[PDB]
Structure formats: C-alpha cells, structure tokens
C-alpha cells in the first residue's frame, strides 16, 4: 500500500474492527491519518473541531480548535450557510426563549393527571380507577413512601454513579443543541457536568441501562407494582435455584442477550436541557424518580386526534414548529421536583425541560393492562418509520419476539389449564382472556405480513405452530363459554 495512509495510532492500514466503521480523521498539523477510534476523540467530538490536532501534536500545537458558534438557532450551529434559516426547536436560541414562556403552558385536568402525596394514597387512587388493567392517567407521587421502590439515599450523586459503573463506561448522550445522540465516556460527562460555569454545549443522557451491573441493579429498582405487571419481568424472572431449574425444564428459558433491557435506566442532564416530544418506544409505560434536580414535562393524552397531529409532526420536514403550538391546547405542563415520582401509562406524548442539573432513575415496561395502547403505538411507530429512516436502537428491542414468547409461555399455558377443567376464564381471569384475544388478533396480522413478504430468531414454521395451538385453545374456551 502507501505509508501516508497508515494510521498513526494503531499503525495499520485497516482497523481491527465502540465501532470504528471505516472512518478516518486527519491531523491538521502533522497531516498523519488516524482511524476515528485511534484519534483519541470520542464520538461526541467528531463534528466539533474545525482544526484537529492529534495527540502527538497538541503539546507543541495546542488543543484542537472548535468551530465558531455562527448560528445558535440551528442544529448546525457551526454552519454559516444556515444563519438566515429559521429557529429550530431543539436549538440553544429556541430553548432560551422557550424558558421565558414555558410557564404559560396550561396545567392538566384531574382526568389527565392525579397528584398524590405518597405511595399509600397512590395505591388507593390507582385501585379506585380499576388498577393496572385500566390504567389510563398519569400519576405524580410527591413522596415515595408506600411505593416499595428501592432507591439510593440522597447524597447519592453523579459521582457515585461513575464510581460504580466505571470511568470508561460509555453512555449514549444527547447533544441538546445539535439534537443528536453520540457516545460519551461517563468520566467525560462528569467533567463537563462539574464545570458548572463553562458549558458551550449542553449534554443530557437518558440511556444508561444498568440492570446488568451487579452493584447498581440493587440500588435502584422499579416500584413493586411495576415489577408485578412487567411483561419482560414475567418472562425473564430474576429467579434462582429450583425456580430457575423448572424454568429450564419447561422450555420457558430465554437467553439473557435476548432480554429487552429497558427497565432500569439512570438519567443525568444539565440545566437548560430539552428533550422534544415523543412517545416512549413500544408504547411502554414509565416510572420516573427525581433523585436530584427538577423536571418539567409537557404532555398530551394518547387520543386519536393527538396521535394524528403527532404522526404529522414527526413526518413533516419542518423543524421550526413546537408541537404544543399545533396541538389545539392538548399540551399540559407538569413540574416534577426532587424526591417526586412520575408514573406514565402507555401512549402519552411528552417533552421535557431540565430547569436544573438533575439525576433521575426510571424505566420502561410493557404490561397487559395497556396492551391495546401498546399495539396502537407500535402501529404509530411503524407508520412514521415508513417515512423517515431511524435507528433500531431507538425502538423497543425484540418487540414482536417478546409477544410470541409471552403468548407461548404465559397465555397459552393459562388458557390450556383453564380449558382442561370447565373453567370459564371470565370468572377469575377475564383480564387474561381479553389480553389473549387482543394479542392473538395482532399476531395474526404479523403472520399474514410475514407470509406476504417473508421474514426479517423464531422460524416462520415455529410461529405457525404457536398460532395453530393458540387458535385451538381459544376456540375450545369460547365453546366452554357459549355453554
């Protein structure tokens, strides 16, 4: 080959390969080339520097020179060609302004959000409304006592987080003003977070999942009521011993690397951070506990009208219009403070402002009581994706497979056991029976689609073997009913 084209880092022409891709950056001083992963830059920096000085230079040349902030109202704040374009919703200019009028956004009705003082009052109100099987409104619980939600004692902060997870642990982080996600070392984030006075750019990570860290996973957990209704938790129980063995004896075992891991997240964001409107992936529900700081959520109920506005909003090229302004007064304001907890059921559209540096623990989960709404959000996502192109990692992992597994391992078993007696399921398991029908119908559609345009882990043949068995037991039970 040719020497000039050898990476001055790993000293090779081809990198070994988080993921380098096949990308290089050149030093503006010595002109040698480095693979991105060999340059000493982290992904969040790939676009910041107008002049890059490699580590070999930079004692004798100085730090890399970053682009000038030419257009604070654009995601491309560094591009002169955009100076004259419109103010974009995520931008620094936009957020400054939005901060001065955000408190005019109206408060919710009692139909939309129920505020309660503690988990005991939450429990009573939750039950008045039909519980999880009929969960439709958001709850804000001022004091976590009664929720059975394991959390770290105050005094716990970002410092303990980086110590437990490790300095080099990489988290996907939001570059607020750019409205994009890049990788950043936990140590790098902490450094920027500590420099309270100098913040050219704001960062906010939402995506630090720690259910696989043996220390962290005991320090912050979902409320008990959530662990009890979580579909993922039902399928990959964290059991041991004979429970686990039986889990193996039945073919109910599932690979740890197949598990959707979205139930234990830590979030940390700088004051002035803004996350724009979205519905959480798979239409999952959310528990959200503020350890430190403050959050302002802007929320809209999951109605067909709101979804149509939202779907249009997401597929439109436009970037200058705040969803709240085209949503016909649907958007409501709810402030959440330190120690307080938000519980959001499937489908709620929401954005969030971070008025103050914050540390949050939360998680996403699916449950039978919101099965219909979850499927409705799946359709919404699928429609949006037909338009714009997105990345898999912003969606619910193994969404479809989870349902095959849940139908096979959970619901089929229950309808079969019911069927083997006279048991009319409507007596002690009406909810199980209605969930089965809803899931079945949605799965029929998935089969039909697969037979039309082929597959994309579970062979087509296996799926078909599950469906026939489900149809059978379902028909058996409805005869037991018509009787």
């Amino acid at each position: 080959p040719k020497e000039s084209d050898r990476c001055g880092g790993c000293g090779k022409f081809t990198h070994e390969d988080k993921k380098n891709d096949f990308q290089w950056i050149g030093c503006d001083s010595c002109q040698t080339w480095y693979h991105f992963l060999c340059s000493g830059l982290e992904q969040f920096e790939y676009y910041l520097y107008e002049k890059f000085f490699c580590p070999k230079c930079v004692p004798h040349t100085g730090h890399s020179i970053r682009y000038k902030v030419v257009a604070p109202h654009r995601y491309r704040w560094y591009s002169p060609n955009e100076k004259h374009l419109g103010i974009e919703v995520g931008s620094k200019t936009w957020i400054e302004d939005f901060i001065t009028r955000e408190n005019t956004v109206p408060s919710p009705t009692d139909d939309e959000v129920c505020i309660v003082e503690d988990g005991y009052e939450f429990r009573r109100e939750f039950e008045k409304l039909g519980g999880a099987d009929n969960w439709g409104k958001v709850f804000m619980v001022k004091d976590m006592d009664g929720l059975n939600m394991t959390m770290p004692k105050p005094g716990f902060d970002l410092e303990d987080v980086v110590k437990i997870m490790g300095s080099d642990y990489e988290v996907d982080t939001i570059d607020v003003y750019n409205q994009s996600t890049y990788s950043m070392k936990l140590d790098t984030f902490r450094k920027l977070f500590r420099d309270t006075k100098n913040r050219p750019l704001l960062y906010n990570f939402l995506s630090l999942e720690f259910s696989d860290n043996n220390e962290m996973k005991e320090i912050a957990k979902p409320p008990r009521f959530v662990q009890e209704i979580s579909m993922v938790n039902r399928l990959w129980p964290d059991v041991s011993g004979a429970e686990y063995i039986k889990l193996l004896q039945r073919e109910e075992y599932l690979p740890e690397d197949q598990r959707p891991k979205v139930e234990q997240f830590c979030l940390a964001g700088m004051a002035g951070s803004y996350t724009d409107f979205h519905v959480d992936f798979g239409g999952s529900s959310v528990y959200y506990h503020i350890l430190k700081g403050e959050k302002i959520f802007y929320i809209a109920a999951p109605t067909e009208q709101n979804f149509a506005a939202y779907q249009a909003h997401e597929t439109s090229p436009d970037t200058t219009t705040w969803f709240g302004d085209i949503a016909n007064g649907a958007v409501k304001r709810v402030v959440i403070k330190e120690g307080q907890t938000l519980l959001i059921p499937a489908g709620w559209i929401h954005a969030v402002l971070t008025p103050v540096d914050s540390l949050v623990f939360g998680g996403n989960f699916l449950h039978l009581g919101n099965l219909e709404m979850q499927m409705r959000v799946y359709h919404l996502e699928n429609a949006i994706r037909k338009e714009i192109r997105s990345e898999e990692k912003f969606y619910f992992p193994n969404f479809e497979l989870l349902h095959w597994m849940y139908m096979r391992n959970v619901l089929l078993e229950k309808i079969t056991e019911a069927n083997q007696e006279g048991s009319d399921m409507r007596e002690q398991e009406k909810n199980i029976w209605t969930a089965s029908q809803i899931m079945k119908a949605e799965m029929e559609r998935w089969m039909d689609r697969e037979l039309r345009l082929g597959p994309e882990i579970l062979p087509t043949d296996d799926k078909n073997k599950i469906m026939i068995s489900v149809r059978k037991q379902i028909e058996i039970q409805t005869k037991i009913q018509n009787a």
Partner: peptide
Amino acid sequence: KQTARKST
C-alpha cells in the same frame, strides 16, 4: 429528525 431520544 429522530436522533435525540432514549437509546437502547
């Protein structure tokens, strides 16, 4: 369009 969002 859809990059600034929760990642798994």
